[PDB]
UniProtKB/Swiss-Prot annotation:
Protein name: Chitin elicitor-binding protein
Location(s), subcellular: Cell membrane
Quaternary structure and partners: Forms homooligomer. Interacts with CERK1. Binds to chitin oligosaccharide elicitor. Interacts with LYP4 and LYP6.
Residues of the full protein shown: 29 to 320 of 356
Post-translational modification: N-glycosylated.
Gene: CEBIP
Organism (species): Oryza sativa subsp. japonica (Rice)
Length: 292
């Protein structure tokens, strides 16, 4: 029982952990550690500039947002069979949870996830699925990107909620908090980040994956589309990337190209990204969006 999720089992989502690096590293090393995402999406998930190298620093005890695919079973959200940890010479399931994964999981959740019958015995070189806490669920019938937050000391629900642009209301109903007062340190919180709206269709492969809070960006459709989110509008801004193994992007009707707008204000209309499909070959779809 990590983060509650109530959507149909098998449903996948994009979620994240706010990861605290014990040691100094680089963004490149985080990518190798988690392998839940690509470097440019990790960079974009934190709002670093496009074309930043993997050697971008991560200071000791600094925090990096690490996106991953979440799978929901009946009741809870779990990171979808990633990340995969390889046991070193004298690891232990409890040390691994706490000192590698910030206590986002418990050793029991690890063992249960890998069918290990006595939490005390794991072999060198044994691989472990680490199921990070996540969802899935909507907030108020609005899409959100849940983020797993490890409460540092001196914090409170007021400050956190302002930090992420969330009402303190949703935080308390989503997280079981009797008396906020003083939040206990080390507590894991479900923080549903607001995200841009999109025109990405149900039928589309990336339908629940382009969930971008403010200031972040991401890539989709075999890296042929770039999507960015600003709170300025909260409408996903998509653009064609121009790798040249990439398919053409259709106009809307005729004459409106991706990102272009027709009309004036509020009643204006925009050629948006609505998804892609991959049977046979990569096809990108677009559709007119009304000003939201
Ligand atoms: C059909 C066949 O023989 N294919 C081989 C693959 O099975 C094998 O992949 C390895 O599989 C084992 C189990 O499939 C993996 O270990 C499992 O890992 C999950 C988390 O990843 C963990 O929860 C399971 O408990 C754990 N089970 C076991 C038995 O350890 C292991 O990670 C895979 N190794 C790699 C490198 O992918 C590959 C590897 O040789 O060979 C195929 O021929
Ligand atoms: C370190 C920090 O952020 N402390 C804040 C404090 O300034 C504020 O008065 C209080 C009430 O909301 O919340 C907490």
């Amino acid at each position: 029982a990590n983060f509650t999720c109530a959507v149909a089992s098998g449903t996948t989502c994009k979620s994240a952990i706010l990861y605290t690096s014990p040691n100094a590293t680089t963004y490149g090393n985080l990518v190798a550690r988690f392998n839940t995402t690509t470097l440019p999406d990790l960079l974009g998930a934190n709002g670093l500039p496009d074309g930043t190298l993997s050697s971008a620093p991560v200071a000791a005890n600094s925090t990096v947002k690490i996106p991953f695919r979440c799978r929901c079973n009946g009741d809870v959200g779990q990171s979808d069979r990633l990340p995969i940890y390889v046991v070193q010479p004298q690891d232990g399931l409890d040390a691994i949870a706490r000192n590698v994964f910030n206590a986002f999981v418990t050793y029991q959740e690890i063992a249960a996830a890998n069918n290990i019958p006595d939490p005390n015995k794991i072999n060198v070189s044994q691989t472990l699925w680490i199921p990070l806490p996540c969802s899935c669920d909507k907030e108020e019938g609005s899409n959100v990107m849940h983020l797993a937050y490890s409460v540092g000391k001196g914090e409170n629900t007021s400050a956190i909620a302002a930090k992420y642009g969330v009402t303190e209301s949703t935080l308390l109903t989503r997280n079981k908090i009797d008396d906020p007062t003083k939040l206990q340190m080390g507590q894991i919180l479900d923080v549903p980040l607001p995200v841009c709206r999109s025109s990405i269709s149900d039928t589309s492969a990336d339908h629940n994956l382009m969930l971008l809070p403010d200031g972040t960006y991401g890539f989709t459709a075999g890296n042929c589309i770039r999507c960015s989110c600003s709170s300025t509008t909260y409408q996903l801004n998509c653009t064609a990337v121009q790798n040249k193994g990439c398919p053409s992007v259709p106009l809307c009707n005729g004459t409106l190209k991706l990102g272009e707008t027709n009309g004036t204000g509020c009643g204006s209309t925009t050629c948006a990204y609505s998804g892609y499909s991959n049977s046979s070959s990569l096809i990108i779809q677009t559709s007119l969006a009304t000003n939201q």
